[PDB]
């Protein structure tokens, strides 16, 4: 279900963001998605530990 | 950016570092009959690299 | 959209919710074009929020 999260963006698919939005701020949007999914993975890792 | 020059004439990469300086040259570079010495491009087969 | 994106015979073109670079690349169902005349003092009001 974490793959369905937009994390405040306009879409949950990074391909859609890359092919839909201007790269100078699409880099920031992809960075935000990356750090959101990284935080989710860190939460899962701590719970697993 | 996105425009006629920002696509086919002059591009700036996302990691560009520096300054851009602009000044009004209407008192010097303009002509009463029009200055045709400066030209710009509008047609190209593909996007011009920065 | 080359007459709007690649070429600019018009004074100002701006895209807020969509990438202006990939206007020919984005594919949509239909467009509702609203045509009207606004004086130069109030043309800044055409923006969300």
UniProtKB/Swiss-Prot annotation, chain B:
Query: What is the recorded phenotype of mutating residue 43 to L?
Result: In strain: Omicron/EG.5.1
Q: Which domain of life is it from?
A: Viruses
**Chain spans, region Immunodominant HLA epitope recognized by the CD8+:** 35-43
Task: Give the protein's biological function.
Answer: Attaches the virion to the cell membrane by interacting with host receptor, initiating the infection. The major receptor is host ACE2. When S2/S2' has been cleaved, binding to the receptor triggers direct fusion at the cell membrane. When S2/S2' has not been cleaved, binding to the receptor results in internalization of the virus by endocytosis using host TFRC and GRM2 and leading to fusion of the virion membrane with the host endosomal membrane. Alternatively, may use NRP1/NRP2 and integrin as entry receptors.
Oligomeric state and interaction partners are given as:
Binds to host ACE2. RBD also interacts with the N-linked glycan on 'Asn-90' of ACE2. Cleavage of S generates a polybasic C-terminal sequence on S1 that binds to host Neuropilin-1 (NRP1) and Neuropilin-2 (NRP2) receptors. Interacts with host integrin alpha-5/beta-1 (ITGA5:ITGB1) and with ACE2 in complex with integrin alpha-5/beta-1 (ITGA5:ITGB1). May interact via cytoplasmic c-terminus with M protein. May interact (via N-terminus) with host bilirubin and biliverdin, thereby preventing antibody binding to the SARS-CoV-2 spike NTD via an allosteric mechanism.
Q: What is this protein called?
A: Spike protein S1
Q: Which residues of the full protein are shown?
A: 414 to 463 of 1273
């Amino acid at each position: 279900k974490q793959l369905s999260s937009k994390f405040g963006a306009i879409s949950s698919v990074l391909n859609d963001i890359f092919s839909r939005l201007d790269p100078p701020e699409a880099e920031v949007q992809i960075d935000r998605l990356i750090t959101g999914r990284l935080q989710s993975l860190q939460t899962y890792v701590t719970q697993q530990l | 950016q996105t425009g006629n020059i920002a696509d086919y004439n002059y591009k700036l990469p996302d990691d560009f570092t520096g300054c851009v300086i602009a000044w009004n040259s209407n008192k010097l570079d303009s002509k009463v009959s029009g200055n045709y010495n400066y030209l710009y491009r509008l047609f190209r087969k593909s996007n011009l690299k920065p | 959209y080359s007459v709007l994106y690649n070429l600019a015979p018009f004074f100002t073109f701006k895209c807020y919710g969509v990438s202006p670079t990939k206007l020919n690349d984005l594919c949509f169902t239909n467009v509702y074009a609203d045509s009207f005349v606004i004086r130069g003092d109030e043309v800044r009001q055409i923006a969300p929020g």
